[PDB]
Structure formats: C-alpha cells, structure tokens
Design a protein around this ligand. Structure first.
Ligand SMILES: Nc1ncnc2c1ncn2[C@@H]1O[C@H](CSCC[C@H](N)C(=O)O)[C@@H](O)[C@H]1O
Length: 241
C-alpha cells in the first residue's frame, strides 16, 4: 500500500497545508448532524474524519483503509484518546460489506481507484454499505483540474505530472511535508463518476464546491487563492439512494 511509506507524514500535511481547512469545513458541511448515526469512514487514514464524527455524537464509527501502517496509526490514536472506533484493513474496491450504515464518509477514496472498473466497484461497495435512507459524503479530485492551469504546491500538494490512464488521467504527486511524501492519484471524468454513481443505485447526487470563506481570503495576500478557484484540484460530492 502506498501509504505504508507515508505514515505520519500525512497527518503532518493535514496540519500545514492551506487546503486542509477548506476540505475539512466542506466535508462537515455536507455531513451535517451526525447525532446517533452509524458511520463508515472509508480510506480513513489515521482516522481523522471518523474520529471527529464520533466526537460530534455519532453512535458507532467504523474505519477502513488499505494501508496496514495507516490502520496501526488509527488504532493507536483511538487508544490515546480512549475512543471506541473500530478499524479494518481492506481494499474498498474488493471488500465484503461490513453492514449497512446511516452515513458513509469517503474523504479521498475514489481518486485512488486505479481503473474506471475499480471506480465503479467502489461505488457499488458504498451503496451496499448504506441503509435505503442513508447518504454518501465524498471528497475527491475535481474532474476539471488540469496541471497546465496551475499547480497546487502552494496549497500543500505538488502535482508532478499528468498522463492519460484509461478514460481518465493519472498523476504523480507529493504532499508538501518535511521531507515530501510521494503518492499517486487518478482523475476520473465527471461523466464516468456520474455513470458509476447511477449504476451503483444512487438516484440522487450533487457536486459540492469547496467552501473557501472570507476569512481564508483575508489571511493571505490578494490572489493567493486564484489557482485554488480557477484550477481547483478538489471537490465534494453527496449521493443518496
Ligand atoms: N483502495 C483503497 N481502499 C481503501 N483505502 C485506500 C485505498 N486506496 C488508498 N486508500 C487510503 O486512502 C487514504 C488517503 S489519505 C486520506 C485519509 C483520511 N480520509 C483523511 O482525509 O484524513 C490513505 O490512508 C490510503 O491508504
């Protein structure tokens, strides 16, 4: 698993990258009230979103990640903070269902599907993980990002290259950490996402813009966020059966 070589550097990135506050705000905006809900946190990393969802009153939280090292970090954080989260090592594209939840949170899952067939498999796994009145909240790569229109290094992600891959694109990148931490991701088109969503059985969905706010703009020089707004690497997505 790629993040077996990243480990704690990902949390370092979340503490230093300018984009992180925006993605975190956007995801919790999409989630809304979690009181009493059962929650499945996919591509959970060290568990950030599932853990904070628990802190905000969810009834039961389960996290899944492909990286054994990241899950060992997640488990240690749950010990450190005395919380009841449970974790599993799985490739979400190939995993058995672990139950039907009120909410699936997938922050940076689908941009790691390494083929359009695996993108479609992941959406089907998510649908199988939801109650009929549940919802998927996802955060992924914006299909319209183009490397030539501006890199994201100033916001925490140095995108190194861009190459056709299947019906989409693949990108090598690094988180801007000390030292930088390399990873790869996949940029699937809006049409392929919407097809995967519908074919998995989600009859409702919407793309959600990143919630850049006035105070973000005020605390940087004018124009700092222009590449973020004109060539955004990220987007939210909410889907409902
Ligand atoms: N196919 C797959 N199935 C499950 N997890 C995956 C995956 N491909 C990548 N990942 C995991 O996705 C994570 C992306 S980093 C994001 C972590 C967390 N959602 C957060 O935002 O804080 C990594 O921990 C990586 O190991």
């Amino acid at each position: 698993a790629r993040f077996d070589s990243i480990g704690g550097l990902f949390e370092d990135f979340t503490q230093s990258a300018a984009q992180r506050a925006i993605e975190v705000r956007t995801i919790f905006h999409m989630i809304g009230d979690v009181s009493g809900k059962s929650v499945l946190d996919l591509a959970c990393g060290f568990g950030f979103f599932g853990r904070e969802i628990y802190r905000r009153g969810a009834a039961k939280v389960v996290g899944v990640d492909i990286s054994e090292k990241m899950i060992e970090l997640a488990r240690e954080e749950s010990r450190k903070y005395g919380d009841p989260l449970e974790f599993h090592v799985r490739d979400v594209a190939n995993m058995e269902p672990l139950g039907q939840f009120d909410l699936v949170n997938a922050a940076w899952l689908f941009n790691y599907a390494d083929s359009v067939e695996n993108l479609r498999k992941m959406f089907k796994v998510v649908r199988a993980s939801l109650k009929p009145d549940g919802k998927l909240v996802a955060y992924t790569v914006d299909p319209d990002f183009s490397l030539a229109k501006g890199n994201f290094a100033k916001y925490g992600v140095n995108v190194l290259n861009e190459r056709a891959w299947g019906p989409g694109y693949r990108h090598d990148a690094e988180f801007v950490t000390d030292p930088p931490s390399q990873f790869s991701f996949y940029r699937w088109s809006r049409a392929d996402y919407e097809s995967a969503i519908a074919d998995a059985g989600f009859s409702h969905f919407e793309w959600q813009k990143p919630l850049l706010e006035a105070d973000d703009i005020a605390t940087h020089p004018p124009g700092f966020w222009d590449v973020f707004q004109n060539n955004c690497l990220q987007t939210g997505l909410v889907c409902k059966p």
